[PDB]
Amino acid sequence: DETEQWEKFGLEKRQGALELIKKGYTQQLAFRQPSSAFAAFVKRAPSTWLTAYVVKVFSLAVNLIAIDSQVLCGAVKWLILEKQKPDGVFQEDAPVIHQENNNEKDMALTAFVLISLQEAKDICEEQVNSLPGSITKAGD
């Protein structure tokens, strides 16, 4: 889209891609816990890293498909409230999925979650209020 190659590649394929994204989104909701958090496996402890990644991917697809705003806003609110320490560090309680004084471990997780939140900055800004404060604390 931002390069505008559809006129020669074929605009007829865009709907197909949209359908693919829709199917992928339909599958991903299988991992959503009732507490608005995404777990690595079905019916298991929710993971902060996976929740942040899912929020980052969802925030990129609202302009394409009809992503539910309730799900994404609930995930962002869960990340900001239940997983963020006052110092500006996002806690992790589920078993780790990626490669993690506890230095160089919380830094990578905080950086990843910050990259995820910067995608949903202007999307859940109305439903979630304290998002800019969390972003500022994490950046500091």
């Binding site: 829709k22 339909t26 599958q27 909701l29 959503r32 539910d68 309730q70």
Partner: protein, 638 residues
Amino acid sequence: SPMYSIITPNILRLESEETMVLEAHDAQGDVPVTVTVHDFPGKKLVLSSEKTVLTPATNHMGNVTFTIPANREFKNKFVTVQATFGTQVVEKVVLVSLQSGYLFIQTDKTIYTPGSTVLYRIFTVNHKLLPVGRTVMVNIENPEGIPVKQDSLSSQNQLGVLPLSWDIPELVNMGQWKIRAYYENSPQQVFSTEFEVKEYVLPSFEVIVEPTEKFYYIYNEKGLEVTITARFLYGKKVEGTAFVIFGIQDGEQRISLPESLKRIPIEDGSGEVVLSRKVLLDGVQNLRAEDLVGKSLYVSATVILHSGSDMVQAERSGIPIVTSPYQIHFTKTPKYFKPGMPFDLMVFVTNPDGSPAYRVPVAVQGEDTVQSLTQGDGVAKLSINTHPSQKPLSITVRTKKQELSEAEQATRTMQALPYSTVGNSNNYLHLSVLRTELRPGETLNVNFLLRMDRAHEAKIRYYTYLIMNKGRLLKAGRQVREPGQDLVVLPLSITTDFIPSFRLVAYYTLIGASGQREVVADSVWVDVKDSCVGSLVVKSGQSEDRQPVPGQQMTLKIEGDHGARVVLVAVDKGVFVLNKKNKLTQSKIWDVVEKADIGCTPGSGKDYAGVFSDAGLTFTSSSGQQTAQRAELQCPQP
């Protein structure tokens, strides 16, 4: 003095034809007629204005049809209807509201698996059950309520049928999914159908365990008998051995019975096992038999094939232990009875689990001669003649199944109040109809019966009858009566326009003994068989001389109304049987239509105005006779 009358439905609908009935009583010559409708608050504008002339040839009977445009000029929206009857004028303010239509969603199966395709159709209809081209939104929701698929369709030029398909991924939320459909214009009305996703399960063969009865009676010496049935997935029966064990269940704790374990041979594919009452009583070491009431039983069966070692298990939990299994109710009885004339009841007997009973005798208490047998739908119809006084009538119905004792039979009591004479004049009208189900093409004889003093009988020369169907006014007319006759029979034809139950309201007017006016009215609710206006039959075109073989060609024949669109789907019949909770049937469609009737009281009211208002009618005359205004869009709860 001439009396001019106006009759119209209680609620008028926009963009739909509405019939207005105009009358002149004791008026000579002919009278011109102009009816107009204005806004209620200020009569600012004319929504419609029609004219007609009432001739003495037709006994001053006229019907003017008008359509209220969807101007939406103003805002419970009311319109005032003013009719000029020559010089005289009669005005009545009637409520107005609009209805959108109905959506019916058809799914081939109710239980799917991850990977299978969901096929569903949306049928668009109006209040008359006719295809209409609108725009409808369809959504699919998971158990959490998150719309996973959204579609915007238009049924225009599609003849009211919308096909849709959804591809279930391999990894989806497991639970009860739903489909929501609603017209774009009126998103306040959403029609929902639900299915299940479940997980892949496939046993070696199917086994069904169920008792003969739907409960257990404590004082039943025969015990509890259970019929175990087994059959393969390809149709042939099973011959083997089944191990069955029963067990009580005190709420959530299963005190399994060890002495009740039995081994039975399954031959021909069906078995049978009986639990003796003595075993059950000794299992709980309780001397009181009544203490087991409310402690449901359960049956566990294990069928083992005779050839190999295939084993499958079946269960049937929740067989209640009850001493008063049947509970009795009234369904469609009127509440006001004309004293001294027969009164028709209707009774509904239900099992402990809420299902309708079958062949349970009912009988009123004290008469003993008004017995009946409960039908397939649980309805038993009785009639009781009423006393000649005006004290309220108390009627009690009891089930008379032989197995139970008198103290354990169901009983329901109802009280009815007399129809209120206008001036204690003891003038009544009575309509007697057959209390069964009719069919289109049959002819119905309605017996108009009249009682009054033998001094003003000659002053009544006619009866006026109106037929209400689907809320609208179906037809009206006259019943000329020769003086001196008490009973007059109206032969009424029944057509496909009467397919849902219609209502008949009749009345006569005369000058009072003192000198005032008098209006006496009665009404009845008549139910006819629910079937489509047309027909649709699917049969085998080829000669019926062979059982169908896999992979071979078969020829089908569909017979239906010319130019219709027919849609087909084939199901396994293993999922059709378990779909008893909700199926797309003509009876269900007509019930859905019947849930939106203007009037709700079955057949009578306290006054003449009550009779006219209950049936969904209004009646205003040049004199001081009129029915109370209705403002609510739904009558009070039953």
